[PDB]
Amino acid sequence: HGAMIRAQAGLLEAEHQAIVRDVLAAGACQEFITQLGRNFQVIYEQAN
Amino acid sequence: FMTDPHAMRDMAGRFEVHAQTVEDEARRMWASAQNISSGMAEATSLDTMAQMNQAFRNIVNMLHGVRDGLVRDANNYEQQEQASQQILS
């Protein structure tokens, strides 16, 4: 269950990376990426 | 491509999919945080959950926002393409 939560967080980060690919593909928008990052990082942090 | 409306809408579709994917992941994580099938509150803390709920909601809004903007851009490119051909009747 602490295992489920780590697995989910791993999956969340794959999704985050998937999103970055699309953003790049959709070429001062480096802030979108940074803010996006922050929020995922917050989620990732709290779940380790 | 920021010139190709059919492509922007497609891109919008993708971000919509991303938004759905995050909402479903947030909902699974909620459940896991709560941690239920007697299990008392040894599970995930009240303040961390709030941070998470907020981070998830931000991500979903941003994703919705990119979708909306692409859709509006397409609409805008068509309206102007159409207005252009008219002026040249």
Numbering used by the authors:
A (entry chain A): 13 to 39, 49 to 69
B (entry chain B): 5 to 41, 46 to 97
What does the paper say about this structure?
Of particular interest are the Esx complexes which are dimers of two subunits (ESAT-6, early secreted antigen of 6 kDa; and CFP-10, culture filtrate protein of 10 kDa) and which are secreted across the cytoplasmic membrane by Type VII secretion (T7S) systems. Mycobacterial ESX secretion systems have been shown to be involved in a variety of physiological processes including conjugation in a non-pathogenic mycobacterium, iron and/or zinc acquisition by both pathogenic and non-pathogenic mycobacterial species, and virulence of pathogenic mycobacteria. The overall architecture of the complexes is similar to known Esx structures in that each heterodimer forms a four helix bundle with the CFP-10 and ESAT-6 subunit homologs each contributing an α-helical hairpin to the complex. The subunit interfaces in the four-helix bundles of the Esx complexes are similar to those of the previously determined Esx complex structures in that the intermolecular interface between the CFP-10 and ESAT-6 subunits is largely hydrophobic.
Using this expression approach we expressed and purified six Esx complexes and determined the crystal structures of M. abscessus EsxEF (EsxEFma), encoded by the MAB_3112 and MAB_3113 genes, M. smegmatis EsxGH (EsxGHms), encoded by the MSMEG_0620 and MSMEG_0621 genes, and M. tuberculosis EsxOP (EsxOPmt), encoded by the Rv2346c and Rv2347c genes, at resolutions of 1.96 Å, 2.70 Å, and 2.55 Å, respectively. The structures of these complexes were determined by single wavelength anomalous diffraction (EsxEFma and EsxGHms) and multiple wavelength anomalous diffraction (EsxOPmt) at resolutions of 3.0 Å, 2.70 Å, and 2.55 Å, respectively. The WXG-containing loops are well ordered in the EsxGHms complexes and in most of the EsxEFma complexes but the majority of the connecting loops are disordered in the EsxOPmt subunit structures. Additional regions of disorder are found at the N- and C-termini of the complexes with the EsxFma and EsxOmt subunits having a substantial number of disordered residues at their C-termini. The average amount of buried surface area in the subunit interfaces varies considerably [EsxEFma, ∼1605 Å2; EsxGHms, ∼1555 Å2; EsxOPmt (form I), ∼1025 Å2; and EsxOPmt (form II), ∼1175 Å2] and the percentage of the surface of each subunit buried in the complex interface is also highly variable, from 13.5–33%, and is related to the degree to which the termini of the subunits are ordered and to the conformations that they adopt.
